[PDB]
Design an enzyme around this catalytic site. Structure first.
Site, PDB file in Angstrom:
ATOM      1  N   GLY A  90     -13.460 -20.731   4.311  1.00  0.00           N
ATOM      2  CA  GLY A  90     -14.384 -20.877   3.199  1.00  0.00           C
ATOM      3  C   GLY A  90     -13.699 -21.366   1.939  1.00  0.00           C
ATOM      4  N   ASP A 122     -16.169 -25.464   9.808  1.00  0.00           N
ATOM      5  CA  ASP A 122     -17.389 -25.360   9.027  1.00  0.00           C
ATOM      6  C   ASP A 122     -17.129 -25.810   7.587  1.00  0.00           C
ATOM      7  OD1 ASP A 122     -15.771 -22.926   8.844  1.00  0.00           O
ATOM      8  OD2 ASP A 122     -17.422 -22.117   7.643  1.00  0.00           O
TER       9      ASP A 122
END
Lengths: 217, 53
Positions: free
Chosen positions: A116, A147
């Site tokens: 993240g 991601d």
């Protein structure tokens, strides 16, 4: 009563966003993502904010060790799939807001920037690295995918051996950790600034303003 | 004179009822107004806070 997970502060015309989860290495949960996503929309409407600075209060230990996927795992084991989809809708929506943000965002990657954390910096044209930077995408070992739009960024920003996304595939599939200067030379970091100089840089960023009749965008 | 005494008494009683109703309304409106003031807006995110301290 408890310390807020993310702290927002004013730096002259710059708005400082500081990740405030030191015990979790600034891991990003739905609460953090939602708070940052909402506050950034307000700063976009404001005419007194020229730029935003995304930093951590734990530097040089970590900037963001990655999204809080351990909590998402418990949700899956408990069939709380609605909770899990909320965690990813918030995080990915924040990564999309940063990518398309019209005002300069300056991320201080002063520490572990993995997962993240990469999404918080990879989407900003001003992603500053330091000697303490440790960029990695260790998702293949946890069973997840690359991601936070890393499959759209890395194939477009890496500098060497990335004609056909070869280097992008090497970092995403092997989970290799890149450190400081190497991250800057590979294109993972736009700038390389010594950690000691971050305080001075932050002050200068708050003092600069668009001249004459030019907007900060 | 009988109409004067009975109209005056009615007026006095009707005035007490009207005041009681009016006060209760004002009280309810004040609570509603205050609740709107205490309602959190999106702009409040741009106001710096130190809640914990």
């Amino acid at each position: 009563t408890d310390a807020p997970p993310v702290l927002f502060t004013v730096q002259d015309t710059a708005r400082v966003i500081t990740l405030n989860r030191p015990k979790k290495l600034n891991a990003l949960n739905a609460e953090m993502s939602e708070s940052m996503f909402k506050t950034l929309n307000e700063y976009a409407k404001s005419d007194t904010t020229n730029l935003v600075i995304l930093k951590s209060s734990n530097r040089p230990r970590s900037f963001c060790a990655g999204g809080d996927v351990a909590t998402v795992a418990i949700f899956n084991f408990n069939k709380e799939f609605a909770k899990s989809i909320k965690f990813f809708t918030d995080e990915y929506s924040l990564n999309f807001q940063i990518a398309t943000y019209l005002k300069p965002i300056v991320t201080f990657m002063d520490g572990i920037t993995m997962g993240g954390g990469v999404g918080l910096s990879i989407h900003t044209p001003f992603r500053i690295a330091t000697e303490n930077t440790k960029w990695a995408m260790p998702e293949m070992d946890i069973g997840f995918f690359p991601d936070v739009g890393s499959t759209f960024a890395l194939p477009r920003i890496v500098t060497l051996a990335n004609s056909n996304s070869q280097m992008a595939l090497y970092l995403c599939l092997t989970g290799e950790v890149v450190t400081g200067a190497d991250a800057y030379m590979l294109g993972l970091a736009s700038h390389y600034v010594s950690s000691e100089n971050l305080d001075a840089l932050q002050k200068r960023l708050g003092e600069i303003s668009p001249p004459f009749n030019n907007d900060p965008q | 004179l009988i109409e004067a005494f009975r109209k005056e008494e009615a007026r006095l009683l009707h005035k007490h009822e009207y005041l009681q109703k009016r006060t209760k309304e004002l009280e309810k409106a004040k609570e509603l107004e205050l609740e709107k003031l205490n309602k959190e807006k999106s702009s409040d995110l741009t106001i710096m806070t130190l809640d914990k301290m």
